[PDB]
Structure formats: C-alpha cells, structure tokens
Short mmCIF file of C-alpha atoms and ligand atoms in Angstrom, two decimals:
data_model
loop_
_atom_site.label_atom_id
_atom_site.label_comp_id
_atom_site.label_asym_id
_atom_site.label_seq_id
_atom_site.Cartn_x
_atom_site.Cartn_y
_atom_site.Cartn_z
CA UNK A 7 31.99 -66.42 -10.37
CA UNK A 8 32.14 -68.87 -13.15
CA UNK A 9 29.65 -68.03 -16.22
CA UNK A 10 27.17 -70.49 -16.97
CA UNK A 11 26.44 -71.57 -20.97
CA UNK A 12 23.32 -69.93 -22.41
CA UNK A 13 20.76 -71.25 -20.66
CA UNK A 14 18.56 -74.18 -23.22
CA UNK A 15 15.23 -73.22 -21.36
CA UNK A 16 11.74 -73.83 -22.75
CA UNK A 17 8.41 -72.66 -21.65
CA UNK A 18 5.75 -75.22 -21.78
CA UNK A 19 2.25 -74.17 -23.51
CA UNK A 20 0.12 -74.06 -20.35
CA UNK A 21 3.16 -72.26 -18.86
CA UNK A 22 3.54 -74.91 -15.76
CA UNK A 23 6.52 -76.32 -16.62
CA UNK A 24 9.92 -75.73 -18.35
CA UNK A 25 12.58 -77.60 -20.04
CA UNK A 26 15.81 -76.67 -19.00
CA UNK A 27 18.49 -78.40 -20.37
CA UNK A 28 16.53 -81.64 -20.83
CA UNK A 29 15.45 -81.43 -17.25
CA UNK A 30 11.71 -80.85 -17.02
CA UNK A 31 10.55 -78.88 -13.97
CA UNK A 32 7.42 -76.78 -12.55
CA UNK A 33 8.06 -73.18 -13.45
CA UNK A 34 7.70 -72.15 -9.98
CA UNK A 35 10.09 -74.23 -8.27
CA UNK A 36 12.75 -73.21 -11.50
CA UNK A 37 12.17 -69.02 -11.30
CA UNK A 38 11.52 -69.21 -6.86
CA UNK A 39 14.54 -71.94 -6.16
CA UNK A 40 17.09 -72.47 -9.46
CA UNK A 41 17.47 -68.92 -10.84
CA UNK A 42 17.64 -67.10 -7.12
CA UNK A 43 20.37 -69.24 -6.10
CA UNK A 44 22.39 -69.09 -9.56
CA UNK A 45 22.14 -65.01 -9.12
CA UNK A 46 23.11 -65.44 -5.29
CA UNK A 47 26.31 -67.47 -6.23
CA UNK A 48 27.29 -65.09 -8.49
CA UNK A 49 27.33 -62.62 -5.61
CA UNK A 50 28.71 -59.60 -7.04
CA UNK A 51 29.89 -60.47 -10.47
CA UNK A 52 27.27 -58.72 -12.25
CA UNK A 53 28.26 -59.23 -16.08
CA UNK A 54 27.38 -63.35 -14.92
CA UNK A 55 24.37 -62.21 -13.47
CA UNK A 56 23.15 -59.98 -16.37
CA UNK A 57 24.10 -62.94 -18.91
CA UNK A 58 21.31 -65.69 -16.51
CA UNK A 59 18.65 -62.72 -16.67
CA UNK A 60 19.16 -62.13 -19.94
CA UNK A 61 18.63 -65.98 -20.70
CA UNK A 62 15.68 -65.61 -18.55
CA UNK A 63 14.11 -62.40 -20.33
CA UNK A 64 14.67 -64.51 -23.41
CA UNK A 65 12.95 -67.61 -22.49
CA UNK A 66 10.02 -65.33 -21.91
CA UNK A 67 10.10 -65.99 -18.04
CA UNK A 68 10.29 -63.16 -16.06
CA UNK A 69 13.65 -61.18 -15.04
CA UNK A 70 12.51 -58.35 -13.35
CA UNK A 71 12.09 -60.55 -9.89
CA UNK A 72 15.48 -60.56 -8.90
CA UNK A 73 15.76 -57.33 -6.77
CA UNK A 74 19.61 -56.07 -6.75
CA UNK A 75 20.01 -58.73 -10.19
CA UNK A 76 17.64 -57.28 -11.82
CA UNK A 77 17.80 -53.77 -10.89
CA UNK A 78 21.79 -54.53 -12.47
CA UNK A 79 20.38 -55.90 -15.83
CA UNK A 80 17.59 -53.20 -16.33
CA UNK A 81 19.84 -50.44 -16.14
CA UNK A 82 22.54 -52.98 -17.96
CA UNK A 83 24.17 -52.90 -22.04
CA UNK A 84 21.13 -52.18 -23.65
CA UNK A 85 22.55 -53.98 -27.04
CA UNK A 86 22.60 -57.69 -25.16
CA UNK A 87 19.43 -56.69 -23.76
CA UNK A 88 17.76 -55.71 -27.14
CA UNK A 89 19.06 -59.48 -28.58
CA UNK A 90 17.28 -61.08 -25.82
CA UNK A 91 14.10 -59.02 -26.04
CA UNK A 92 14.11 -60.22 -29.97
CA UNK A 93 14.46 -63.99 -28.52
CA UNK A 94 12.19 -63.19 -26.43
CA UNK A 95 9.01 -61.95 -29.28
CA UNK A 96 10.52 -65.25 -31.13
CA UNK A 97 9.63 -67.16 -27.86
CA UNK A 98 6.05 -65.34 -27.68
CA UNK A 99 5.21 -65.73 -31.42
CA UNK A 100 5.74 -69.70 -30.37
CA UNK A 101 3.63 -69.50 -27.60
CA UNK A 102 1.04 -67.93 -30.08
CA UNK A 103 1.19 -70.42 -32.52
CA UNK A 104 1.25 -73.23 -29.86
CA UNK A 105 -1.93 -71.90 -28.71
CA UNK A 106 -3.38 -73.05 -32.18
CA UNK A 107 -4.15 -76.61 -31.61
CA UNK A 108 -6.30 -78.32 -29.97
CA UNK A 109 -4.72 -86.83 -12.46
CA UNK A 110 -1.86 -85.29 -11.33
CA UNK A 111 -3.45 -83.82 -8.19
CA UNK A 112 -5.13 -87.19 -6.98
CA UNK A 113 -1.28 -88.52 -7.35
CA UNK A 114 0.04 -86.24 -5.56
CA UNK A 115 -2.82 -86.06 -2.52
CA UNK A 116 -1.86 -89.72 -1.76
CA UNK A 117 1.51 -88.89 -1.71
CA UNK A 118 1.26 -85.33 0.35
CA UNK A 119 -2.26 -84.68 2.03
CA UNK B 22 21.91 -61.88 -1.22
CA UNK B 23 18.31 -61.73 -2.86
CA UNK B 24 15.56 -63.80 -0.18
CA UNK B 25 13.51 -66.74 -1.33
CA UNK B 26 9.16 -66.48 -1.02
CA UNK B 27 8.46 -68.18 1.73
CA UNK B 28 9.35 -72.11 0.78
CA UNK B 29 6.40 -73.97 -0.09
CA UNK B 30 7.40 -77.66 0.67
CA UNK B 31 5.41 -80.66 1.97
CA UNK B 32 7.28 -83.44 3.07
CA UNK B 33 5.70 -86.89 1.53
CA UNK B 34 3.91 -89.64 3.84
CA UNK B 35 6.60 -92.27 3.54
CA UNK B 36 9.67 -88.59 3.77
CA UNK B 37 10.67 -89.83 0.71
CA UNK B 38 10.03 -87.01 -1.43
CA UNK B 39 9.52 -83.70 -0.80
CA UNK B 40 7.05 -81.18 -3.07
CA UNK B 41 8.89 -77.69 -3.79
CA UNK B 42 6.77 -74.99 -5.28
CA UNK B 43 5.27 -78.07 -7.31
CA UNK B 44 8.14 -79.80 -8.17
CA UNK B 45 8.41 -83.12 -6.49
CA UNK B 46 12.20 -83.82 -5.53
CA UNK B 47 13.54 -86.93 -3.45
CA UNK B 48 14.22 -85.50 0.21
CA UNK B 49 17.98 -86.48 0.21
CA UNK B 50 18.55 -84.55 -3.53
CA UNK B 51 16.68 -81.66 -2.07
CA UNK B 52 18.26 -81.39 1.48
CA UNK B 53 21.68 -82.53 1.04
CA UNK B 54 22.26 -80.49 -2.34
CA UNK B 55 19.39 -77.76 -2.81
CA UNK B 56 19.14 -76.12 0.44
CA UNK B 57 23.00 -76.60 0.88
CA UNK B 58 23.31 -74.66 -2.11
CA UNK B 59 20.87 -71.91 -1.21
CA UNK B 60 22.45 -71.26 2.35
CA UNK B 61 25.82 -71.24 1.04
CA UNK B 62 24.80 -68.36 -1.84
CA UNK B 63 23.49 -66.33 1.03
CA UNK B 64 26.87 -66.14 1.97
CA UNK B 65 26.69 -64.35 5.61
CA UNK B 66 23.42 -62.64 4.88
CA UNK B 67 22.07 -63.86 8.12
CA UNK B 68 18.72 -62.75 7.56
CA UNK B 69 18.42 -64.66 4.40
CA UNK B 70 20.05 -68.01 5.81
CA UNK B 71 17.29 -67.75 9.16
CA UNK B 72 14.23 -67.33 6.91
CA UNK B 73 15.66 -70.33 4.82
CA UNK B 74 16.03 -72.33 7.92
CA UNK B 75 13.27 -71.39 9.86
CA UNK B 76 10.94 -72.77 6.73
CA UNK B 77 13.31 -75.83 6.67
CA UNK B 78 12.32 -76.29 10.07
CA UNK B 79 8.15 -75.48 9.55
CA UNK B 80 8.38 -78.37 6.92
CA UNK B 81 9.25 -80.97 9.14
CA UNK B 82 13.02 -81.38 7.97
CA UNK B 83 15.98 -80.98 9.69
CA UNK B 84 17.58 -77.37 9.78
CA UNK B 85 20.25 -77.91 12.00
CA UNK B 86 22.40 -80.38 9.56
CA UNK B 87 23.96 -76.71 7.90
CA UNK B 88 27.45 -75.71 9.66
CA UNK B 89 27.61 -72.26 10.97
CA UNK B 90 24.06 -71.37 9.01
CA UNK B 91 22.65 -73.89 11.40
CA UNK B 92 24.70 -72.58 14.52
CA UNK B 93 23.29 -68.53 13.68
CA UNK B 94 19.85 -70.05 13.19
CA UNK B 95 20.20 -72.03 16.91
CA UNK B 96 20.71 -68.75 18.39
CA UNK B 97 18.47 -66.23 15.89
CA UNK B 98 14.76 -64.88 17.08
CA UNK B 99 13.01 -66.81 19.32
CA UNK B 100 10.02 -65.48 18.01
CA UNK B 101 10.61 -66.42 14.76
CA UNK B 102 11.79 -69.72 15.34
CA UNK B 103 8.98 -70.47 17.47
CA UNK B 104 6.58 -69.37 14.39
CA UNK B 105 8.35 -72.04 12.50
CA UNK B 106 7.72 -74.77 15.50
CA UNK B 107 4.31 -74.25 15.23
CA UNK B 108 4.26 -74.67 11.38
CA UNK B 109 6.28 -77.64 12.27
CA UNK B 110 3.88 -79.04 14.39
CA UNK B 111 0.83 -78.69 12.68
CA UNK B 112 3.03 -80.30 9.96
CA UNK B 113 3.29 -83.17 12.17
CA UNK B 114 -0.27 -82.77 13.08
CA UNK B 115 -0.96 -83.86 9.22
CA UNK B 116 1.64 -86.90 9.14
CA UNK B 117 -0.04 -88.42 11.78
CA UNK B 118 -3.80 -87.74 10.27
CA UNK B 119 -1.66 -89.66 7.06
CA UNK B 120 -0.47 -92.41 8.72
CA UNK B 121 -3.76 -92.93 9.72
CA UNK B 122 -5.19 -92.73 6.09
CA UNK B 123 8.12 -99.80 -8.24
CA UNK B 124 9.27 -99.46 -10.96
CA UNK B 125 12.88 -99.93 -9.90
CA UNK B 126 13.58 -99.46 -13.51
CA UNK B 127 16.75 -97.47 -11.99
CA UNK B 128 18.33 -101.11 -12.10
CA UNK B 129 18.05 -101.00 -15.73
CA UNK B 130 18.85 -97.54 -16.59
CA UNK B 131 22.17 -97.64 -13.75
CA UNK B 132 22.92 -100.83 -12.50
CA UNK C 7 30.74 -72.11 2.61
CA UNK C 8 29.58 -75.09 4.08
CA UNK C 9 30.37 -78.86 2.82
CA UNK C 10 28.50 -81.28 1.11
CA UNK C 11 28.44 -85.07 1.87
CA UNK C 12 29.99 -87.23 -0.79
CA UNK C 13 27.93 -86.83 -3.58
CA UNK C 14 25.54 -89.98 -4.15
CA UNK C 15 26.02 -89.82 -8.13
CA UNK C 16 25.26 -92.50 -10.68
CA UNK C 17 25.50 -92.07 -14.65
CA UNK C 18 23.27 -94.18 -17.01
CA UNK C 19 23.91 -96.69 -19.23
CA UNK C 20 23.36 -94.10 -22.22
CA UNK C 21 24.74 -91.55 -20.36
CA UNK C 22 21.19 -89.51 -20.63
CA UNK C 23 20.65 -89.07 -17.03
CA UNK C 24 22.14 -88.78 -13.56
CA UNK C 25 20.74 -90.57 -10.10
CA UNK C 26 21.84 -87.68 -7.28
CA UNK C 27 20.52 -88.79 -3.92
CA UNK C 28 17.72 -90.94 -5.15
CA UNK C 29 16.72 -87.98 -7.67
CA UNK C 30 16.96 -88.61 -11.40
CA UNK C 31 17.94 -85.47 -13.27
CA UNK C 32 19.03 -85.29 -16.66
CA UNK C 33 22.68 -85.27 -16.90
CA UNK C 34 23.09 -81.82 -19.08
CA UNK C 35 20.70 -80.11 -16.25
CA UNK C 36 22.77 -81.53 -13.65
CA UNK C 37 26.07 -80.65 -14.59
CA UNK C 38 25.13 -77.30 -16.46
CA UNK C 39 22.99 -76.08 -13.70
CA UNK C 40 23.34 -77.46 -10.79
CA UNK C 41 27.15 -78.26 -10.21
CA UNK C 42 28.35 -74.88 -11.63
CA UNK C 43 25.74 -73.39 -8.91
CA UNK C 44 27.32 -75.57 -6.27
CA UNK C 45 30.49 -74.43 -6.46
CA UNK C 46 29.85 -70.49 -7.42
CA UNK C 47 27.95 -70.98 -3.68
CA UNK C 48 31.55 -72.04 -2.53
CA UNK C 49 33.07 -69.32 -3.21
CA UNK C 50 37.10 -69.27 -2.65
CA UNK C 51 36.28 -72.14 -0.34
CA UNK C 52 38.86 -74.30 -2.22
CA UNK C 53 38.82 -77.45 0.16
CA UNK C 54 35.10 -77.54 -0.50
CA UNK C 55 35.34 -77.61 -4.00
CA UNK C 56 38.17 -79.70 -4.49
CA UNK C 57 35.54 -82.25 -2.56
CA UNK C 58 32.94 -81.38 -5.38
CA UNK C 59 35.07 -82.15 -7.65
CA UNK C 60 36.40 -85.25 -6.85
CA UNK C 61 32.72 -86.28 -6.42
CA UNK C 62 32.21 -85.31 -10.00
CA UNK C 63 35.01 -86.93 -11.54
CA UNK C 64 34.81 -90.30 -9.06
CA UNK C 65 31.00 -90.16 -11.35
CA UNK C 66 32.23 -90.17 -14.84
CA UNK C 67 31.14 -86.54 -15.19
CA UNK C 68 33.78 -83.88 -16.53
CA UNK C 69 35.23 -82.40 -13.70
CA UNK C 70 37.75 -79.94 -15.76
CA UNK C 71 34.58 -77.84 -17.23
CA UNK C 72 34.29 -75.03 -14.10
CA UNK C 73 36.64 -72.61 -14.95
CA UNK C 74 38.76 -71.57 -12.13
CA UNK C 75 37.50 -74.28 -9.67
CA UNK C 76 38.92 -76.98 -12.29
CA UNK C 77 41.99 -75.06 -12.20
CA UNK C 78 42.59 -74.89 -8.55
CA UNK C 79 41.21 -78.65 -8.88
CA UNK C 80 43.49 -79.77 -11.27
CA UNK C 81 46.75 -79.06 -8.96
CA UNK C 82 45.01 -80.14 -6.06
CA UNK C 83 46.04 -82.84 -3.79
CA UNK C 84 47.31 -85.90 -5.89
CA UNK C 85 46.36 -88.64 -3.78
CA UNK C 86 42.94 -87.63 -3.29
CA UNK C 87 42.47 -87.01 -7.31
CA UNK C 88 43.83 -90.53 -7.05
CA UNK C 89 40.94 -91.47 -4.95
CA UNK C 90 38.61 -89.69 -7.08
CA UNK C 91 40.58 -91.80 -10.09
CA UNK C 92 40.39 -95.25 -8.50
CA UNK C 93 36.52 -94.81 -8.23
CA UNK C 94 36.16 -92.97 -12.24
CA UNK C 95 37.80 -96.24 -13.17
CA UNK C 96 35.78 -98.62 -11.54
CA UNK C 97 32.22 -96.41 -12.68
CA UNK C 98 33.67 -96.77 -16.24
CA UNK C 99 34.14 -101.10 -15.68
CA UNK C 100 30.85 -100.67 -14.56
CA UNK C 101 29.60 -99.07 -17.70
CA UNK C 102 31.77 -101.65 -19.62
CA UNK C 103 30.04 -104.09 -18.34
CA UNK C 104 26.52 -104.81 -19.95
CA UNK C 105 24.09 -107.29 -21.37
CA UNK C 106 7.85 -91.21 -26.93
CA UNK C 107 10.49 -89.07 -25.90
CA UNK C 108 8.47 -86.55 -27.11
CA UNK C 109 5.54 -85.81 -25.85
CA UNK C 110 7.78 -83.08 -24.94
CA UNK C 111 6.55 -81.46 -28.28
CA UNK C 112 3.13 -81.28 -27.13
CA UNK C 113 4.36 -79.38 -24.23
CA UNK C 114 6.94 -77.18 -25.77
CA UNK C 115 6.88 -77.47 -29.22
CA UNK C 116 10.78 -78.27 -29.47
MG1 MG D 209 17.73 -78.37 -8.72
#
C-alpha cells in the first residue's frame, strides 16, 4: 500500500473533536470510520499500518482498537514505538496544561429528530 | 479486514446530510466516497461488507448502489437483512413524524 | 474494487479548502487522508485508479503524489489524461479569473 505522511492530528481539550490535517472532526467518527478504513486499505502491509497506529498512539488517541493492526504494532519495533509513546506524554502534558484555564444539540434535533 | 461498530448514522429531514458517529457529512460526500471506500478496504471479507451494508440499509440509504458488495449483500442472510428492514422502517417511521414537525457563501469561496 | 462516480471536486479561491459532493473539507485532509485511502482501497485495480486520478488532476489537486498509483497513472492512457488536462486547464481559467481562524486554539491549543 502507499504510506501516508505523519499524520498532523490534534486532540481537542474536551476530547470531542480532532484536528487532522486542518480538517476538524468528532473523535468518534475519525477513530470508528477514518483510521479503520486507512488500516483496511493497507491490507497486509503491516510496516504502513504500524506507521498510522503509531501516529495514533502519538496523538494520544487510542491504538490498541484495531484488532489484527494493532495486535501487529504491539508486538511491533519497540524503538518507533518508544518515539511515539514520548509524543505521546508531550501530547498529555498539553492536555494537562490545557486543562488550566478557564446549542449544538438543539441544531442538530431540527436537523435529525 | 478489521469490522466497523455498528454505524451510527441518521439521515437529515431534508437527506441532505447525514450524522456519522457525530460528525455531520453531506449524504452524497458520505455515500458516494466514504462507504465506497470502506467496502472496497474490506476487500472480499464478506462478512465485513454485509454488516456495512445491512446498516447502510437500517439508515434509510441506499445499499444496493456498491457493485459486487451490493450483489453478495442481495443474496446474504435473510435474517439479517430483514433486522436491517426493520431498522429501516422505523427509520422511516421518524421521517414521516419529521415531516410532520444559506449561506451560499460556497459562491464566494469557489465560484 | 469497486468504482467511484466522477468525483464532484471544487478548489477554493485560496486554495484552503475542497467542495467534494456538497462537503467542504479542508484541502490538506482531503488529499492527505482521504484520496491516498481511496486508492490503497483499490488495490491493483488500475482502471479504477487511473479514474481517481484523472478526477484529481481534472481538480487542480496533485495527482503525481500516490506513489505507485501516480506511476501506473502517469503512463496511463493519453487521451484520457488529456481529458483530465482539458478540464485542469479550464479549473485553473477559473481560478484566474476573479474580482478568527483560531478559535481553534481554544480547542487545541495549536
Ligand atoms: Mg472522511
């Protein structure tokens, strides 16, 4: 498969959303939709694969939900892994020090029930 | 091929947009690129592509506009398809309840 | 793999954004993401991504950025990179002619 770049993705502070590549959308619909189907089109290629969950580990989201992916990139080079667990305390310590500060709904029940 | 969670989407009042696991998508983006994309990285893992479809089908949209994965899906569980027919319908159920209750700035920004 | 209709793509003015099928996305997303996902999903399905691809560069987007798909791509039927061609050039007239982002730092910090 071809390799994606290293994936620009941001956690928002309350967690809902992320910023991926300029693109803001709900963290659900990126980790349930976006990031099964770019592991499913790499199909077997599994050094692509490790390099998305390893982009994913490091953006603090979580890359263990994968099943055959992630089973791959657990038991994967531990080095790579280690450089995105450091990206992803960096990521963490942000979320900490974001968290030191201080009408969507009815928009979206006229729209959907 | 991994499976999805079973697809939470609502289809909008006017089928204009669709509302994916919170993300609100137009229905055209969504079913002419997303789910395209999804069936085709199942490959032919059947049993992925007919839970795909058969919650394409609960959400009111049309899951037989998808080639072969459509074709398999025809002829997959009855059961299970008719599962997803009732979602469908009590789907419908709520347009209906619904229906009885700009900006165009893209001009700008692409001509 | 399956096909895909041709693809419904706009650029914007500033080049910021695409319009895909009535959905606004922003361009890096879209062709980062989303396109390299379409066409891994193809597979060796060459006739289907040759199709992508013409899409993409009929848009103004950089169809030579996917690796082995712009490879096969690139020595892929003349006449209907022609096509694709004819269409690039009349999206780029189109762009010739002409008469609180963040907010995203309360979210995410960066
Ligand atoms: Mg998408």
């Amino acid at each position: 498969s071809i390799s994606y770049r290293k994936l620009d993705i941001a956690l928002s502070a309350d967690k809902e959303t992320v910023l991926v590549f300029g693109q803001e959308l709900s963290t659900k619909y990126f980790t349930e939709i976006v990031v099964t189907t770019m592991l499913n089109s790499t199909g077997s290629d599994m050094a692509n694969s490790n390099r998305i969950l390893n982009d994913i580990h490091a953006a603090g989201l979580d890359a263990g939900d994968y099943g055959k992916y992630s089973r791959w990139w657990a038991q994967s080079n531990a080095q790579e892994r280690q450089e995105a667990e450091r990206r992803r305390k960096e990521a963490k310590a942000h979320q900490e020090r974001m968290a030191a500060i201080h009408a969507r709904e009815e928009a979206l029940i006229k729209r959907f029930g």
